[PDB]
């Protein structure tokens, strides 16, 4: 029997809000280490890696490893049924055919309990630049550049980070410079200059995880796909991997 109880239950809601638009069905790895997910998107161009460590949960028990095939949209709806301040418990048997979601109330007078059905889905350091910026600012830049073109050139040097886009109506570039504050500051760790090109649609998909964290981390290098990382509040992390265009 697997049982995970988490007081801050909004975290799950936010995670699936970030994921429902990217992956339709996915296999959750349930272990003594926590809740994990590794998957491609429906268009097979990007990679999503979600980690929620067991220590971050209020109660955690995982007798056997579980490979829960889940339709992320259905689970997102069911989590929509939960209140933002509810306590969320995920429960499964060793033969995980049903998943149980328990939503607890303030004065223990409302107790929602939903049961999903799981499917038989088999589960399947080089970096020159690291930018830490506000998650809202990254989402804003992605949304803004979406109007200009389909591909974004991210340039990273010791002077700042630039997001450029070109398309039918013209071009456009945004320049973020490091600040003096140093979750509202922009910080650049550049060990080698970097100039790469990525699909803006997938970046806008990644930015759906903005409510999970106030800061986003863009880890960039010429030979590896970009990593967009959102750190949760003292729990796991959501990492998106997107290959640079040739």
Author numbering: 1 to 124, 131 to 188, 192 to 255
Reproduce text from the manuscript describing this model.
pmcProliferating cell nuclear antigen (PCNA) is a sliding clamp protein that acts as a molecular “hub” for chromosomal DNA replication, repair, and maintenance. PCNA consists of three identical subunits that form a closed ring that surrounds DNA. Each subunit contains one partner binding region that various factors use to interact with PCNA, allowing the trimeric ring to accommodate up to three partners simultaneously. Beyond its role in enzymatic processivity, PCNA functions as a scaffold that congregates various factors that copy, surveil, and repair DNA; thus, PCNA coordinates DNA replication with DNA repair, chromatin remodeling, cell cycle regulation, and apoptosis.
Here, we report a second PCNA substitution (C148S) that also causes PARD. We found that overall the structure of PCNA-C148S is similar to that of PCNA-WT with an RMSD value of 0.85 Å, indicating no significant global changes to the structure. Furthermore, the conformation of residues surrounding C148S does not differ significantly from PCNA-WT. Although the S228I variant has a deformed partner binding cleft, this region is not obviously altered in PCNA-C148S. It is important to note that a portion of the binding cleft exhibits weak density in our PCNA-C148S structure. Despite this issue, there is unambiguous density for Y133, a residue that dictates the conformation of the partner binding cleft. Because Y133 is in the same conformation as seen in PCNA-WT, we conclude that the partner binding cleft is unchanged in PCNA-C148S. From a structural point, the C148 residue is buried in a hydrophobic pocket near the interface between subunits and participates in a π-sulfur interaction with F144. These types of interactions have been shown to confer substantial protein stability. We found that all three PCNA variants display unfolding curves consistent with a two-state unfolding mechanism. Both PCNA-C148S and -S228I have dramatically reduced thermal stability compared with PCNA-WT (PCNA-WT Tm: 52.0 ± 0.03 °C, PCNA-C148S Tm: 42.0 ± 0.06 °C, and PCNA-S228I Tm: 44.0 ± 0.1 °C). Our combined structural and affinity binding studies indicate that, in contrast to PCNA-S228I, PCNA-C148S does not exhibit the defect in partner binding that was thought to drive PARD.
